[PDB]
Amino acid sequence: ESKGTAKSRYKARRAELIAERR
RNA sequence: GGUUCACCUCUAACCGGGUGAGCC
Numbered sequence: 390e391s392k393g394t395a396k397s398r399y400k401a402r403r404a405e406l407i408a409e410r411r
Numbered sequence: 412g413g414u415u416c417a418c419c420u421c422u423a424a425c426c427g428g429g430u431g432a433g434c435c
Contacts, residue, residue, distance in 0.1 A: 394417090395419060395420090400422095403424095404423085407423075
């Protein structure tokens with residue numbers, strides 16, 4: 390949702406790291 | 412003081428912690 394902020398992009402990057410934790 | 416933008420970080424998330432630069 391509509392945050393272009395660095396927090397909400399970092400949250401998307403955390404979710405992508407949750408597919409690569411390991 | 413205000414205001415607008417831009418960046419990094421904690422967590423599965425809330426809740427939190429930092430930074431840069433405009434504009435006034």
